[PDB]
Amino acid sequence: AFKDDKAIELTIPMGKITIDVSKRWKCRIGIRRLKKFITKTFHDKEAEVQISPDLNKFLWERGMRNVPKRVRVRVNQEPYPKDPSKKVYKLSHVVVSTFKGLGTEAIAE
Amino acid sequence: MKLPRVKELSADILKCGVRRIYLDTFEPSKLSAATSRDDIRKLIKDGLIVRKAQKIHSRYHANKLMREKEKGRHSGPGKVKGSKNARMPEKDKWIKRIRDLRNTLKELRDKG
Amino acid sequence: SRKGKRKVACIGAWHPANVRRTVARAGQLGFHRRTAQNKKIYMMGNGKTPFSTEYDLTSKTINPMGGFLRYGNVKSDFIMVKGGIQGPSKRVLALRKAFAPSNLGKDNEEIVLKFVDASSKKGYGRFQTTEEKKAYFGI
Amino acid sequence: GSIKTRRIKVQLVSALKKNRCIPQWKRACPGFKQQYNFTKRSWKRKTLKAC
RNA sequence: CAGCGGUGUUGUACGAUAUGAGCUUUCUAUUGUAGUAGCGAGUAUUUGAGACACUGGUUGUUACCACCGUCGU
RNA sequence: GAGCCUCUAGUGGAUGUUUUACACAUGUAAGGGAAUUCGGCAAAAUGGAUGCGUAACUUCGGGAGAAGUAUUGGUUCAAUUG
RNA sequence: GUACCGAGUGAUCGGUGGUGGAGGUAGAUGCAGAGCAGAUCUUGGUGGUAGUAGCGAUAAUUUGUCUUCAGCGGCAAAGACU
RNA sequence: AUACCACACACAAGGGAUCGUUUGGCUCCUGGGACGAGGAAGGGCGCAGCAGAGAGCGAUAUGUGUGGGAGCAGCAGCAAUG
């Protein structure tokens, strides 16, 4: 995975990355742009991104015309099974009470 | 035996719509092997095919509003759209009155 | 009208049987070279030395509260000139001594400043310094 | 529809038995020169006029 | 991405607590005493609060040093 | 058995890109208010219920919802259809 | 039938080398359904325009997982609509 | 004109002209000129070991008698007891 097989835990500013996107389709295009954010943060454009169903379900919670302001996610990096020339990044939802104090952390296991 | 067909036959057996049938995920082989209504009856007995519950539609607000209107709330001049006669029919008021009065006179005469 | 209202309706006569270069057509607008003649220097100064007028006895730099919107704070020397100037913030410009002297009375008059505005350019700016904001609010 | 006369039904029964390709063994016979049965029809492309 | 400073926009968060035009008289222990309440729009305090953005200021953490082609010496 | 919202039962694909100008369906506008145009064409304004108050003319039936004006939410009470 | 080369003012005629696989002329006369660039000619076959114009009125779609072997196909979980 | 457009030649595509062939047509001549209540002409439906169309035949849907005589076109079976 990452250095010392750690997972990286980060927060995604969904409010900012979607500023220009139309109200009618906000949640549909937000998914395309969450994946793009990840690939630039780890400098790996050609890689795959995989979204766990719990994270999908959190994002769609107020229907198509909305998206949450911030979301906290744990990321793992693995070789892509269907073509191991690529990597795949796997995203898991982390439930938080408040965002105050949460930076970017790397955690063992 | 394609899985869409399993749902149709199950819907027939459990007397509900296809939108309420749940197929269990961990033994698709066991489902796909089914050939007949008697196979499906066994799968239903074993709990691999399940009828889901209905979606909720509560009467909380309807009851609350009804009690308030019984106390005489709402029902002011800015809440009514029909004519006085549509809301409280005039022929019905007459018919209620005159039957009471006639009944009163009948009893008084008959009792002397 | 059908087929659109935001156009020139007639783009020529039958003869000559070509479109003339004098008729208006759609195309590029903006991003052209332009020279503005005879602009006057009101003030010259430095971004980190405070200054005062004979009348405004506050001492402050040229920088407004929170800086200029996509630039921040001036640090080096600066010039101040009358009116507006070509291009957005951050573009390079060339300055030249005037080609010929002006006879107009509006150009050749003296300038005496009494106040310079230093309030915020984001939103309605209602204070001239952080001291005033700290005094208006509590503590 | 579901209601039919006897005369209409026999027309449908006959029109249904005739609608078949050349059987695969005939193609091997020395003297036989047909490629495809030109009398085959589709319900999407023609009417029987049974009415 | 977060602190901590700075500059704005909106208008005073959730939850508690107190009051409120009026309407009402319930319970426990036990013979007679003591205990002893409900229902209610709104308003005030905590609270220029809470939310949201930008920072060419400053601290922490995390990521990034490749590769392929063309013309020349 | 209007429009708007839900229960039972049923439902959906020519891919990606924030995407100028000119369009086609729509919103909003300082001061002025038909100056526009063959022509107020298009749009705006009025709108339900309750009360007060209602002209010429008329075949005496009508005109007539004439016109013109006021009221309307939530809560807690009285009184019983006002 | 196809390339070359020669003869004739010309309509046309002759030879050589490949392809083809069973029929064909030179002279004199006889009989005609006897010579094409055109008729908005008749029938059949093919271009440029052009990888262009267009293919998207209506409720709306996302994620995982298996097949499919590469079907927004099927199944689970959400989001919508009549 | 490095790559576009045009023309010439060789090879590969695309189409079906030409030449060679014909169990068909047309014309003239000669014969014939034979249907039905004893159900005609014309229409429908059935019949094969594997059988759609067409040909042949009627629930006897390849039967009887006479004259002949070697195979039944594919696959499986039949045939001098035809």
Side-chain angles (χ1 to χ4, degrees), chain A residues 13 15-17 19 70, chain C residues 66 69-70 122:
Chain A
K16 300 180 192 190
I17 73 173
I19 188 161
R70 298 180 150 86
Chain C
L69 276 189
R70 272 159 264 106
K122 182 154 71 181

mmCIF file of all heavy atoms in Angstrom, chain A residues 13 15-17 19 70, chain C residues 66 69-70 122, chain E residues 1-2 4-8 52-56:
data_model
loop_
_atom_site.group_PDB
_atom_site.id
_atom_site.type_symbol
_atom_site.label_atom_id
_atom_site.label_comp_id
_atom_site.label_asym_id
_atom_site.label_seq_id
_atom_site.Cartn_x
_atom_site.Cartn_y
_atom_site.Cartn_z
ATOM 1 N N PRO A 13 -13.496 18.577 0.414
ATOM 2 C CA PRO A 13 -14.370 19.749 0.376
ATOM 3 C C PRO A 13 -15.317 19.745 -0.823
ATOM 4 O O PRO A 13 -15.133 20.495 -1.783
ATOM 5 C CB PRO A 13 -13.361 20.904 0.354
ATOM 6 C CG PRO A 13 -12.142 20.355 -0.362
ATOM 7 C CD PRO A 13 -12.156 18.862 -0.124
ATOM 8 N N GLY A 15 -18.168 20.902 -1.241
ATOM 9 C CA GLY A 15 -18.752 22.205 -1.518
ATOM 10 C C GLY A 15 -17.955 23.021 -2.537
ATOM 11 O O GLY A 15 -18.548 23.733 -3.345
ATOM 12 N N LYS A 16 -16.622 22.931 -2.472
ATOM 13 C CA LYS A 16 -15.745 23.754 -3.287
ATOM 14 C C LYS A 16 -15.613 23.158 -4.682
ATOM 15 O O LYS A 16 -15.717 23.884 -5.660
ATOM 16 C CB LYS A 16 -14.365 23.919 -2.647
ATOM 17 C CG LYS A 16 -14.346 24.572 -1.273
ATOM 18 C CD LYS A 16 -12.943 24.679 -0.723
ATOM 19 C CE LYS A 16 -12.898 25.054 0.744
ATOM 20 N NZ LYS A 16 -11.522 25.389 1.182
ATOM 21 N N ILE A 17 -15.406 21.838 -4.776
ATOM 22 C CA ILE A 17 -15.097 21.190 -6.044
ATOM 23 C C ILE A 17 -16.297 21.203 -6.998
ATOM 24 O O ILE A 17 -16.133 20.928 -8.190
ATOM 25 C CB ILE A 17 -14.491 19.783 -5.841
ATOM 26 C CG1 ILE A 17 -15.521 18.746 -5.373
ATOM 27 C CG2 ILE A 17 -13.264 19.843 -4.934
ATOM 28 C CD1 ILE A 17 -15.028 17.306 -5.325
ATOM 29 N N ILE A 19 -18.548 23.976 -7.238
ATOM 30 C CA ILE A 19 -19.022 25.363 -7.240
ATOM 31 C C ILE A 19 -19.696 25.776 -8.559
ATOM 32 O O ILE A 19 -20.617 26.596 -8.543
ATOM 33 C CB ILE A 19 -17.896 26.343 -6.833
ATOM 34 C CG1 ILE A 19 -18.419 27.768 -6.634
ATOM 35 C CG2 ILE A 19 -16.731 26.313 -7.814
ATOM 36 C CD1 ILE A 19 -17.502 28.659 -5.821
ATOM 37 N N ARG A 70 -18.653 18.838 3.620
ATOM 38 C CA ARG A 70 -17.413 18.118 3.891
ATOM 39 C C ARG A 70 -17.720 16.654 4.189
ATOM 40 O O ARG A 70 -18.775 16.345 4.737
ATOM 41 C CB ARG A 70 -16.726 18.696 5.128
ATOM 42 C CG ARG A 70 -16.324 20.146 4.944
ATOM 43 C CD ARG A 70 -15.646 20.822 6.107
ATOM 44 N NE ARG A 70 -14.754 21.820 5.532
ATOM 45 C CZ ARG A 70 -15.084 23.062 5.185
ATOM 46 N NH1 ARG A 70 -16.316 23.515 5.357
ATOM 47 N NH2 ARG A 70 -14.164 23.860 4.672
ATOM 48 N N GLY C 66 -7.264 44.310 4.437
ATOM 49 C CA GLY C 66 -7.356 43.041 3.728
ATOM 50 C C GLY C 66 -6.671 43.014 2.358
ATOM 51 O O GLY C 66 -6.716 41.987 1.688
ATOM 52 N N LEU C 69 -7.779 42.764 -3.980
ATOM 53 C CA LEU C 69 -8.535 41.518 -3.913
ATOM 54 C C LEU C 69 -7.737 40.272 -4.296
ATOM 55 O O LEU C 69 -7.806 39.282 -3.564
ATOM 56 C CB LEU C 69 -9.850 41.608 -4.692
ATOM 57 C CG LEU C 69 -11.045 42.231 -3.961
ATOM 58 C CD1 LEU C 69 -12.308 42.043 -4.783
ATOM 59 C CD2 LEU C 69 -11.249 41.678 -2.552
ATOM 60 N N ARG C 70 -7.002 40.313 -5.413
ATOM 61 C CA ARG C 70 -6.260 39.130 -5.827
ATOM 62 C C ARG C 70 -4.759 39.419 -5.940
ATOM 63 O O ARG C 70 -4.081 38.896 -6.828
ATOM 64 C CB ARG C 70 -6.902 38.497 -7.065
ATOM 65 C CG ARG C 70 -7.999 37.501 -6.723
ATOM 66 C CD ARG C 70 -8.956 37.271 -7.874
ATOM 67 N NE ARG C 70 -10.132 38.115 -7.727
ATOM 68 C CZ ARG C 70 -10.406 39.203 -8.443
ATOM 69 N NH1 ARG C 70 -9.593 39.608 -9.405
ATOM 70 N NH2 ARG C 70 -11.516 39.879 -8.197
ATOM 71 N N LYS C 122 -13.651 44.292 -0.508
ATOM 72 C CA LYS C 122 -14.603 43.201 -0.390
ATOM 73 C C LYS C 122 -15.781 43.666 0.463
ATOM 74 O O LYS C 122 -15.587 44.106 1.593
ATOM 75 C CB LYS C 122 -13.892 42.033 0.292
ATOM 76 C CG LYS C 122 -14.724 40.769 0.450
ATOM 77 C CD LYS C 122 -13.885 39.512 0.530
ATOM 78 C CE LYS C 122 -13.114 39.371 1.828
ATOM 79 N NZ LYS C 122 -12.282 38.143 1.849
ATOM 80 P P C E 1 -8.490 22.238 1.099
ATOM 81 O OP1 C E 1 -9.829 22.823 0.784
ATOM 82 O OP2 C E 1 -7.536 23.117 1.859
ATOM 83 O "O5'" C E 1 -8.716 20.836 1.842
ATOM 84 C "C5'" C E 1 -9.334 20.838 3.136
ATOM 85 C "C4'" C E 1 -8.568 19.965 4.094
ATOM 86 O "O4'" C E 1 -7.176 19.823 3.721
ATOM 87 C "C3'" C E 1 -8.476 20.577 5.484
ATOM 88 O "O3'" C E 1 -9.738 20.374 6.110
ATOM 89 C "C2'" C E 1 -7.336 19.754 6.083
ATOM 90 O "O2'" C E 1 -7.733 18.444 6.430
ATOM 91 C "C1'" C E 1 -6.386 19.674 4.887
ATOM 92 N N1 C E 1 -5.350 20.737 4.898
ATOM 93 C C2 C E 1 -4.341 20.710 5.859
ATOM 94 O O2 C E 1 -4.312 19.784 6.683
ATOM 95 N N3 C E 1 -3.409 21.683 5.857
ATOM 96 C C4 C E 1 -3.459 22.663 4.955
ATOM 97 N N4 C E 1 -2.521 23.593 4.991
ATOM 98 C C5 C E 1 -4.480 22.715 3.976
ATOM 99 C C6 C E 1 -5.393 21.736 3.980
ATOM 100 P P A E 2 -10.540 21.715 6.487
ATOM 101 O OP1 A E 2 -11.989 21.503 6.181
ATOM 102 O OP2 A E 2 -9.848 22.887 5.851
ATOM 103 O "O5'" A E 2 -10.390 21.697 8.091
ATOM 104 C "C5'" A E 2 -9.383 22.530 8.701
ATOM 105 C "C4'" A E 2 -8.654 21.792 9.798
ATOM 106 O "O4'" A E 2 -7.421 21.257 9.253
ATOM 107 C "C3'" A E 2 -8.204 22.727 10.927
ATOM 108 O "O3'" A E 2 -9.144 22.819 11.999
ATOM 109 C "C2'" A E 2 -6.873 22.124 11.371
ATOM 110 O "O2'" A E 2 -7.009 21.060 12.286
ATOM 111 C "C1'" A E 2 -6.315 21.668 10.030
ATOM 112 N N9 A E 2 -5.556 22.678 9.301
ATOM 113 C C8 A E 2 -5.878 23.201 8.078
ATOM 114 N N7 A E 2 -5.002 24.066 7.636
ATOM 115 C C5 A E 2 -4.036 24.111 8.623
ATOM 116 C C6 A E 2 -2.852 24.854 8.746
ATOM 117 N N6 A E 2 -2.422 25.714 7.829
ATOM 118 N N1 A E 2 -2.109 24.669 9.858
ATOM 119 C C2 A E 2 -2.538 23.800 10.777
ATOM 120 N N3 A E 2 -3.644 23.063 10.774
ATOM 121 C C4 A E 2 -4.358 23.257 9.653
ATOM 122 P P C E 4 -8.457 27.882 16.599
ATOM 123 O OP1 C E 4 -9.159 27.841 17.928
ATOM 124 O OP2 C E 4 -9.349 28.151 15.416
ATOM 125 O "O5'" C E 4 -7.327 29.037 16.608
ATOM 126 C "C5'" C E 4 -6.392 29.200 17.739
ATOM 127 C "C4'" C E 4 -5.249 30.124 17.373
ATOM 128 O "O4'" C E 4 -4.481 29.596 16.254
ATOM 129 C "C3'" C E 4 -5.643 31.524 16.892
ATOM 130 O "O3'" C E 4 -6.077 32.392 17.947
ATOM 131 C "C2'" C E 4 -4.360 31.960 16.170
ATOM 132 O "O2'" C E 4 -3.331 32.441 17.011
ATOM 133 C "C1'" C E 4 -3.935 30.653 15.489
ATOM 134 N N1 C E 4 -4.409 30.561 14.081
ATOM 135 C C2 C E 4 -3.725 31.261 13.083
ATOM 136 O O2 C E 4 -2.730 31.930 13.391
ATOM 137 N N3 C E 4 -4.143 31.157 11.800
ATOM 138 C C4 C E 4 -5.216 30.416 11.496
ATOM 139 N N4 C E 4 -5.594 30.356 10.228
ATOM 140 C C5 C E 4 -5.929 29.702 12.500
ATOM 141 C C6 C E 4 -5.490 29.801 13.760
ATOM 142 P P G E 5 -7.045 33.624 17.549
ATOM 143 O OP1 G E 5 -7.774 34.083 18.787
ATOM 144 O OP2 G E 5 -7.902 33.276 16.361
ATOM 145 O "O5'" G E 5 -6.006 34.774 17.128
ATOM 146 C "C5'" G E 5 -6.369 35.601 16.012
ATOM 147 C "C4'" G E 5 -5.170 36.311 15.446
ATOM 148 O "O4'" G E 5 -4.348 35.360 14.719
ATOM 149 C "C3'" G E 5 -5.578 37.343 14.391
ATOM 150 O "O3'" G E 5 -5.851 38.630 14.961
ATOM 151 C "C2'" G E 5 -4.410 37.290 13.404
ATOM 152 O "O2'" G E 5 -3.288 38.025 13.848
ATOM 153 C "C1'" G E 5 -4.142 35.794 13.388
ATOM 154 N N9 G E 5 -4.986 35.026 12.469
ATOM 155 C C8 G E 5 -5.864 34.023 12.792
ATOM 156 N N7 G E 5 -6.454 33.485 11.757
ATOM 157 C C5 G E 5 -5.908 34.156 10.682
ATOM 158 C C6 G E 5 -6.170 34.008 9.303
ATOM 159 O O6 G E 5 -6.954 33.223 8.749
ATOM 160 N N1 G E 5 -5.420 34.897 8.541
ATOM 161 C C2 G E 5 -4.523 35.802 9.048
ATOM 162 N N2 G E 5 -3.895 36.578 8.157
ATOM 163 N N3 G E 5 -4.270 35.944 10.346
ATOM 164 C C4 G E 5 -5.007 35.105 11.101
ATOM 165 P P G E 6 -7.299 39.273 14.653
ATOM 166 O OP1 G E 6 -7.406 40.617 15.325
ATOM 167 O OP2 G E 6 -8.415 38.315 14.978
ATOM 168 O "O5'" G E 6 -7.240 39.516 13.066
ATOM 169 C "C5'" G E 6 -6.433 40.609 12.561
ATOM 170 C "C4'" G E 6 -6.395 40.525 11.056
ATOM 171 O "O4'" G E 6 -6.188 39.155 10.650
ATOM 172 C "C3'" G E 6 -7.694 40.898 10.337
ATOM 173 O "O3'" G E 6 -7.887 42.313 10.302
ATOM 174 C "C2'" G E 6 -7.422 40.273 8.969
ATOM 175 O "O2'" G E 6 -6.623 41.071 8.123
ATOM 176 C "C1'" G E 6 -6.705 38.981 9.352
ATOM 177 N N9 G E 6 -7.582 37.821 9.355
ATOM 178 C C8 G E 6 -7.946 37.109 10.464
ATOM 179 N N7 G E 6 -8.747 36.115 10.187
ATOM 180 C C5 G E 6 -8.927 36.185 8.816
ATOM 181 C C6 G E 6 -9.689 35.359 7.958
ATOM 182 O O6 G E 6 -10.384 34.383 8.270
ATOM 183 N N1 G E 6 -9.625 35.775 6.629
ATOM 184 C C2 G E 6 -8.904 36.847 6.184
ATOM 185 N N2 G E 6 -8.948 37.082 4.869
ATOM 186 N N3 G E 6 -8.165 37.622 6.987
ATOM 187 C C4 G E 6 -8.226 37.236 8.286
ATOM 188 P P U E 7 -9.413 42.800 10.442
ATOM 189 O OP1 U E 7 -9.460 44.272 10.691
ATOM 190 O OP2 U E 7 -10.152 41.941 11.425
ATOM 191 O "O5'" U E 7 -10.045 42.515 9.003
ATOM 192 C "C5'" U E 7 -9.582 43.258 7.854
ATOM 193 C "C4'" U E 7 -10.274 42.677 6.648
ATOM 194 O "O4'" U E 7 -10.022 41.249 6.616
ATOM 195 C "C3'" U E 7 -11.805 42.721 6.691
ATOM 196 O "O3'" U E 7 -12.344 44.016 6.411
ATOM 197 C "C2'" U E 7 -12.135 41.657 5.638
ATOM 198 O "O2'" U E 7 -12.013 42.147 4.316
ATOM 199 C "C1'" U E 7 -11.066 40.600 5.924
ATOM 200 N N1 U E 7 -11.553 39.484 6.757
ATOM 201 C C2 U E 7 -12.274 38.487 6.133
ATOM 202 O O2 U E 7 -12.516 38.489 4.936
ATOM 203 N N3 U E 7 -12.694 37.478 6.956
ATOM 204 C C4 U E 7 -12.474 37.368 8.313
ATOM 205 O O4 U E 7 -12.915 36.394 8.920
ATOM 206 C C5 U E 7 -11.713 38.437 8.888
ATOM 207 C C6 U E 7 -11.288 39.430 8.100
ATOM 208 P P G E 8 -13.795 44.339 7.040
ATOM 209 O OP1 G E 8 -13.906 45.804 7.331
ATOM 210 O OP2 G E 8 -14.069 43.421 8.197
ATOM 211 O "O5'" G E 8 -14.796 44.023 5.820
ATOM 212 C "C5'" G E 8 -15.956 43.172 6.053
ATOM 213 C "C4'" G E 8 -16.247 42.304 4.849
ATOM 214 O "O4'" G E 8 -15.457 41.089 4.936
ATOM 215 C "C3'" G E 8 -17.700 41.820 4.773
ATOM 216 O "O3'" G E 8 -18.513 42.753 4.057
ATOM 217 C "C2'" G E 8 -17.557 40.451 4.095
ATOM 218 O "O2'" G E 8 -17.475 40.599 2.694
ATOM 219 C "C1'" G E 8 -16.229 39.946 4.637
ATOM 220 N N9 G E 8 -16.306 39.076 5.809
ATOM 221 C C8 G E 8 -15.788 39.347 7.046
ATOM 222 N N7 G E 8 -15.956 38.372 7.903
ATOM 223 C C5 G E 8 -16.610 37.387 7.190
ATOM 224 C C6 G E 8 -17.055 36.107 7.599
ATOM 225 O O6 G E 8 -16.945 35.573 8.711
ATOM 226 N N1 G E 8 -17.674 35.417 6.556
ATOM 227 C C2 G E 8 -17.843 35.901 5.286
ATOM 228 N N2 G E 8 -18.488 35.107 4.424
ATOM 229 N N3 G E 8 -17.433 37.109 4.900
ATOM 230 C C4 G E 8 -16.826 37.801 5.899
ATOM 231 P P C E 52 -20.453 25.355 7.953
ATOM 232 O OP1 C E 52 -20.530 23.926 7.521
ATOM 233 O OP2 C E 52 -19.490 25.723 9.036
ATOM 234 O "O5'" C E 52 -20.058 26.309 6.727
ATOM 235 C "C5'" C E 52 -20.929 26.382 5.578
ATOM 236 C "C4'" C E 52 -20.715 27.702 4.866
ATOM 237 O "O4'" C E 52 -20.970 28.812 5.763
ATOM 238 C "C3'" C E 52 -19.288 27.999 4.385
ATOM 239 O "O3'" C E 52 -18.910 27.299 3.198
ATOM 240 C "C2'" C E 52 -19.382 29.505 4.137
ATOM 241 O "O2'" C E 52 -19.904 29.807 2.856
ATOM 242 C "C1'" C E 52 -20.314 29.961 5.266
ATOM 243 N N1 C E 52 -19.576 30.634 6.368
ATOM 244 C C2 C E 52 -19.237 31.979 6.208
ATOM 245 O O2 C E 52 -19.568 32.564 5.164
ATOM 246 N N3 C E 52 -18.555 32.613 7.188
ATOM 247 C C4 C E 52 -18.205 31.958 8.293
ATOM 248 N N4 C E 52 -17.544 32.632 9.217
ATOM 249 C C5 C E 52 -18.562 30.593 8.484
ATOM 250 C C6 C E 52 -19.233 29.972 7.504
ATOM 251 P P A E 53 -17.380 26.795 3.184
ATOM 252 O OP1 A E 53 -17.264 25.666 2.200
ATOM 253 O OP2 A E 53 -16.901 26.549 4.589
ATOM 254 O "O5'" A E 53 -16.553 28.068 2.664
ATOM 255 C "C5'" A E 53 -16.476 28.336 1.237
ATOM 256 C "C4'" A E 53 -16.263 29.810 0.989
ATOM 257 O "O4'" A E 53 -16.815 30.598 2.071
ATOM 258 C "C3'" A E 53 -14.806 30.268 0.948
ATOM 259 O "O3'" A E 53 -14.202 29.916 -0.308
ATOM 260 C "C2'" A E 53 -14.994 31.774 1.144
ATOM 261 O "O2'" A E 53 -15.365 32.424 -0.055
ATOM 262 C "C1'" A E 53 -16.150 31.841 2.142
ATOM 263 N N9 A E 53 -15.768 32.115 3.528
ATOM 264 C C8 A E 53 -15.902 31.264 4.594
ATOM 265 N N7 A E 53 -15.492 31.772 5.729
ATOM 266 C C5 A E 53 -15.073 33.043 5.397
ATOM 267 C C6 A E 53 -14.508 34.068 6.162
ATOM 268 N N6 A E 53 -14.280 33.977 7.467
ATOM 269 N N1 A E 53 -14.176 35.213 5.529
ATOM 270 C C2 A E 53 -14.404 35.304 4.214
ATOM 271 N N3 A E 53 -14.925 34.398 3.389
ATOM 272 C C4 A E 53 -15.249 33.276 4.052
ATOM 273 P P C E 54 -12.763 29.186 -0.287
ATOM 274 O OP1 C E 54 -12.674 28.204 -1.416
ATOM 275 O OP2 C E 54 -12.453 28.691 1.098
ATOM 276 O "O5'" C E 54 -11.708 30.365 -0.555
ATOM 277 C "C5'" C E 54 -12.036 31.411 -1.499
ATOM 278 C "C4'" C E 54 -11.431 32.713 -1.028
ATOM 279 O "O4'" C E 54 -12.176 33.226 0.105
ATOM 280 C "C3'" C E 54 -9.994 32.647 -0.496
ATOM 281 O "O3'" C E 54 -9.034 32.483 -1.551
ATOM 282 C "C2'" C E 54 -9.930 33.965 0.280
ATOM 283 O "O2'" C E 54 -9.707 35.053 -0.593
ATOM 284 C "C1'" C E 54 -11.336 34.039 0.897
ATOM 285 N N1 C E 54 -11.393 33.535 2.294
ATOM 286 C C2 C E 54 -10.961 34.355 3.341
ATOM 287 O O2 C E 54 -10.542 35.491 3.080
ATOM 288 N N3 C E 54 -11.001 33.884 4.611
ATOM 289 C C4 C E 54 -11.453 32.652 4.854
ATOM 290 N N4 C E 54 -11.488 32.238 6.110
ATOM 291 C C5 C E 54 -11.892 31.799 3.801
ATOM 292 C C6 C E 54 -11.847 32.278 2.550
ATOM 293 P P U E 55 -7.506 32.157 -1.141
ATOM 294 O OP1 U E 55 -6.758 31.682 -2.356
ATOM 295 O OP2 U E 55 -7.444 31.253 0.062
ATOM 296 O "O5'" U E 55 -6.996 33.632 -0.744
ATOM 297 C "C5'" U E 55 -5.594 33.855 -0.472
ATOM 298 C "C4'" U E 55 -5.419 34.806 0.684
ATOM 299 O "O4'" U E 55 -6.615 34.831 1.500
ATOM 300 C "C3'" U E 55 -4.335 34.383 1.683
ATOM 301 O "O3'" U E 55 -2.986 34.686 1.266
ATOM 302 C "C2'" U E 55 -4.745 35.179 2.919
ATOM 303 O "O2'" U E 55 -4.376 36.539 2.827
ATOM 304 C "C1'" U E 55 -6.266 35.094 2.844
ATOM 305 N N1 U E 55 -6.827 34.029 3.696
ATOM 306 C C2 U E 55 -6.781 34.204 5.066
ATOM 307 O O2 U E 55 -6.283 35.186 5.598
ATOM 308 N N3 U E 55 -7.316 33.181 5.802
ATOM 309 C C4 U E 55 -7.893 32.033 5.317
ATOM 310 O O4 U E 55 -8.352 31.210 6.104
ATOM 311 C C5 U E 55 -7.924 31.930 3.890
ATOM 312 C C6 U E 55 -7.400 32.911 3.144
ATOM 313 P P G E 56 -2.115 33.488 0.623
ATOM 314 O OP1 G E 56 -2.274 33.448 -0.877
ATOM 315 O OP2 G E 56 -2.400 32.204 1.364
ATOM 316 O "O5'" G E 56 -0.589 33.875 0.939
ATOM 317 C "C5'" G E 56 -0.281 35.258 1.102
ATOM 318 C "C4'" G E 56 0.841 35.652 0.178
ATOM 319 O "O4'" G E 56 0.461 35.417 -1.204
ATOM 320 C "C3'" G E 56 1.202 37.137 0.286
ATOM 321 O "O3'" G E 56 2.452 37.262 0.968
ATOM 322 C "C2'" G E 56 1.141 37.656 -1.157
ATOM 323 O "O2'" G E 56 2.415 37.672 -1.752
ATOM 324 C "C1'" G E 56 0.237 36.645 -1.858
ATOM 325 N N9 G E 56 -1.201 36.926 -1.821
ATOM 326 C C8 G E 56 -1.907 37.630 -0.872
ATOM 327 N N7 G E 56 -3.197 37.672 -1.099
ATOM 328 C C5 G E 56 -3.355 36.951 -2.273
ATOM 329 C C6 G E 56 -4.531 36.664 -3.011
ATOM 330 O O6 G E 56 -5.695 37.002 -2.755
ATOM 331 N N1 G E 56 -4.252 35.898 -4.144
ATOM 332 C C2 G E 56 -3.003 35.468 -4.520
ATOM 333 N N2 G E 56 -2.932 34.740 -5.643
ATOM 334 N N3 G E 56 -1.893 35.731 -3.826
ATOM 335 C C4 G E 56 -2.140 36.478 -2.723
#
